[PDB]
C-alpha cells in the first residue's frame, strides 16, 4: 500500500523543488490576472479541482491517486498560463499520468476517454454545453508536455498519511478522522499544497476538526515540536476557504468565468 519513498520527504523532489515561494507564485499569476480577477482565478481552481475529483471517482481511483493528479495540474498552471494548454484537456491527462505511477491496476485508453466524456456531460453541463472534443492522441501529446514541465517529478506526498498517524496518536479515530479527512480534501481547492509541507497541512485540518466538534486537544498540540505560527497561517486559509465556498455559486458563475479565460492562439 503505497509505501515507496514514504520516509524520504526531506530529501525528496517535492520538498527541494516543488515547495514554492508565495510571492514567486503571485508574480507568475499576473499574466492571467490581465483577463481574470483574483477572485475569478481562485474560483477556476476550485472548479477544476472538482472536475479532477469527479473523474477520479468515476474511474474508481483511491483518493491519494486523485490528489497526486490535482497537484500535477496545480504545478502546471503555477508555471504557465491557462492559454498554454486547455485545462479541459490537462485535467484527464493529469489523472491518466497519476494512475500510471501506481502498479495496482491500470487505466485503459478507451476507459479514460469514456470517463472524461461521461463526467463532463452528466456532472458539469452547467459549464460545458458541447461534448468533450479531445481524442486519445491529444492526451498522449499533452502527457509529454506535462512530464517535461514537472522535470519528471512524479512522487507526491499528501497530508492523509501523517493525519492518520496523528489521530491514532490522540486515540480519537472514530471521533475525528472522517471530518479531518474531508477538510484535507477541501485544502486542494487552495494553493496550500504548493506552499507548505504535508504534515503541517494535516495538523491544521486536525485543529479545525477539533474546533468544529468541540474537543479540547490544546495539551496534545502543545506536546508537539512544530512552528505553530505556520499552522495558524494554514488554519486562516482553511477558514477563508469556507467563506469563499459560502459566497461562491459554482453552477451559476462558471460558464461566464470560463469564457473570460485567455484562449490558445492558433498557428499562422
Amino acid at each position: 500500500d503505497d509505501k515507496a519513498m514514504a520516509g524520504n520527504f526531506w530529501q525528496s523532489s517535492h520538498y527541494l523543488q516543488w515547495i514554492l515561494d508565495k510571492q514567486d507564485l503571485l508574480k507568475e499569476r499576473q499574466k492571467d490576472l490581465k483577463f481574470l480577477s483574483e477572485e475569478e482565478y481562485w474560483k477556476l481552481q476550485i472548479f477544476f479541482t472538482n472536475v479532477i475529483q469527479a473523474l477520479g471517482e468515476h474511474l474508481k481511483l483511491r483518493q491519494q491517486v486523485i490528489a497526486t493528479a490535482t497537484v500535477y495540474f496545480k504545478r502546471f498552471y503555477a508555471r504557465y498560463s491557462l492559454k498554454s494548454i486547455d485545462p479541459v484537456l490537462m485535467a484527464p491527462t493529469c489523472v491518466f499520468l497519476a494512475s500510471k505511477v501506481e502498479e495496482f491496476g491500470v487505466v485503459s485508453n478507451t476507459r479514460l476517454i469514456a470517463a472524461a466524456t461521461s463526467v463532463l456531460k452528466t456532472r458539469f453541463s452547467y459549464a460545458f454545453p458541447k461534448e468533450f472534443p479531445y481524442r486519445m492522441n491529444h492526451i498522449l501529446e499533452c502527457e509529454f508536455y506535462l512530464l517535461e514541465l514537472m522535470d519528471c517529478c512524479l512522487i507526491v506526498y499528501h497530508p492523509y498519511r501523517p493525519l492518520l498517524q496523528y489521530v491514532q496518536d490522540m486515540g480519537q479515530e472514530d471521533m475525528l478522522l472522517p471530518l479531518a479527512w474531508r477538510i484535507v480534501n477541501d485544502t486542494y481547492r487552495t494553493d496550500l499544497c504548493l506552499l507548505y509541507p504535508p504534515f503541517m497541512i494535516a495538523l491544521a485540518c486536525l485543529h479545525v476538526a477539533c474546533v468544529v466538534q468541540q474537543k479540547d486537544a490544546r495539551q496534545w498540540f502543545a506536546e508537539l515540536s512544530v512552528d505553530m505560527e505556520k499552522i495558524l497561517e494554514i488554519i486562516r486559509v482553511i477558514l477563508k476557504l469556507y467563506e469563499q465556498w459560502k459566497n461562491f455559486d459554482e453552477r451559476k458563475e462558471m460558464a461566464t468565468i470560463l469564457s473570460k479565460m485567455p484562449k490558445p492562439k492558433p498557428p499562422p
Binding site: 525528496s12 498560463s81 498554454s84 502498479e103 491500470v106 498522449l140 512530464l147 519528471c152 512524479l154 499562422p268
Partner: protein
C-alpha cells in the same frame, strides 16, 4: 489546440539526445529493457562516458513511468543514478542518461570461471558489502529490486568512482506486486507459488550471488527446462545443495499453494546426505569461516527466518581482516576487458 507561441518556444529550447550525445555504433546492451549505448558529449565540456538507455516501446508505459518516478527520487552511491530524461516528441521515445559502468559481476565471474580466482584479497567481501548497502537503501525506502542477479550488479571502471558497485535494472513495474503475472536466483517460496515479492526474496538472491563469488559457479545451476511458478528441476537442485527442509525448519511451508505438488513429486529420503556444509566444502570453503556462517543466514529456506540486509551488514564477517574497501579492486590493476560494441 495548444498555444502556438508556447509550442514553438518549447520546441526551440528542448534538448534533443542526438544533438547532445555521440552514440551511433556504440551499443553495449540490448534486451527487454530496450537499447543501451555508451555515449560521449558532442559539445566537449564533460570528458567522460555515459550510459544512454532508450526504453523499449513507445510513449509512457507503466514500466517507464515507475522507473522515471523512483529513479528521480533515489540517491545512494551503490545504486545507479539517473542524470537526465530526454523525451523525443517526434517518435515518442523516452531516453534515460546514466553514468557509465565498464564492468559487471556476470563478466567478472565469467572471466575467473574461464581461468584455471578473485585475485585481490577482500574483493568478494567488498562487493558483498556494497550490494548489501544498496539493497538496504532501497528496502528502507520500501523499494524492492525483484530480479537481482550478477548481470545487473554493475561495477565502475577507471575514474573517480573506481571499483564501486552500482545496482541497476530494478524491476520497477510488476502488476499488483505479483510474480504470477533462468530461475537460478529465485527463492524457494517463489517456486512454491508465492503471490507477492518481498524483501526476503531480494536477500536470497544476494546469498546466491555471494556463493557464486566465492566458488565462481552458480550455486543453484540448472538446465533451461512457463505460465506457472512451479519448477521441478530448479527445486531439485536447491534440495541437492541445501537438503530437504524439516517441518521445524519451515513451518509455514504447508500454507504455500504448491505444497501438495511438492509432496507429490519429492521424497525427503532422496536428499538425506545433502547440506550446504557438504556443498561448500567441495568448493574449498571452510564451514567454520565467518563467510560461511553469513552465507547460511542469507540462504535460509524459510523467508521469515532469513536475515535482513541491515543485520547482514552488522555481521562480524565485515569486522574480520581484510576489511571492505570503497574500491573493490583495492587499488590493484583491472585485468577485465572493456565492453565490446554490438
Amino acid at each position: 489546440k495548444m498555444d502556438y507561441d508556447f509550442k514553438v518556444k518549447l520546441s526551440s529550447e528542448r534538448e534533443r539526445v542526438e544533438d547532445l550525445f555521440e552514440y551511433e555504433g556504440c551499443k553495449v546492451g540490448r534486451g527487454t529493457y530496450g537499447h543501451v549505448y555508451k555515449a560521449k558529449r558532442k559539445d566537449g565540456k564533460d570528458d567522460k562516458d555515459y550510459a544512454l538507455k532508450q526504453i523499449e516501446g513507445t510513449g509512457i508505459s507503466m514500466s517507464a513511468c515507475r522507473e522515471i518516478a523512483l529513479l528521480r527520487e533515489l540517491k545512494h552511491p551503490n545504486v545507479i543514478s539517473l542524470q537526465k530524461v530526454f523525451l523525443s516528441h517526434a517518435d515518442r521515445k523516452v531516453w534515460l542518461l546514466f553514468d557509465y559502468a565498464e564492468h559487471d559481476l556476470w563478466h567478472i565471474i565469467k572471466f575467473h570461471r574461464a581461468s584455471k580466482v578473485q585475485l585481490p584479497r577482500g574483493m568478494v567481501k567488498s562487493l558483498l558489502y556494497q550490494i548489501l548497502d544498496g539493497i538496504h537503501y532501497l528496502h528502507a525506502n520500501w523499494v524492492l529490486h525483484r530480479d537481482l542477479k550478477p548481470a545487473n550488479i554493475l561495477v565502475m571502471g577507471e575514474g573517480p568512482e573506481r571499483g564501486r558497485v552500482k545496482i541497476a535494472d530494478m524491476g520497477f513495474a510488476r502488476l499488483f506486486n505479483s510474480p504470477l503475472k533462468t530461475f537460478w536466483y529465485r527463492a524457494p517460496e517463489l517456486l512454491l507459488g508465492a503471490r507477492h515479492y518481498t524483501k526476503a526474496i531480494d536477500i536470497w538472491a544476494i546469498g546466491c550471488i555471494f556463493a557464486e563469488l566465492l566458488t565462481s559457479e552458480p550455486i543453484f545451476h540448472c538446465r533451461q527446462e512457463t505460465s506457472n511458478p512451479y519448477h521441478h528441476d530448479q527445486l531439485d537442485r536447491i534440495f541437492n545443495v541445501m537438503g530437504f527442509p524439516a517441518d521445524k525448519d519451515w513451518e509455514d511451508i504447508k500454507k504455500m499453494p504448491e505444497h501438495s505438488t511438492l509432496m507429490k513429486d519429492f521424497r525427503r529420503n532422496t536428499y538425506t546426505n545433502c547440506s550446504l556444509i557438504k556443498y561448500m566444502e567441495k568448493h574449498k570453503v571452510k564451514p567454520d569461516s565467518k563467510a560461511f556462517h553469513l552465507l547460511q543466514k542469507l540462504l535460509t529456506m524459510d523467508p521469515i527466518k532469513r536475515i535482513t540486509s541491515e543485520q547482514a551488514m552488522q555481521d562480524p564477517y565485515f569486522l574480520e581482516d581484510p576489511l571492505p574497501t570503497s574500491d573493490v579492486f583495492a587499488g590493484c590493476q583491472i585485468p577485465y576487458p572493456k565492453r565490446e560494441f554490438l
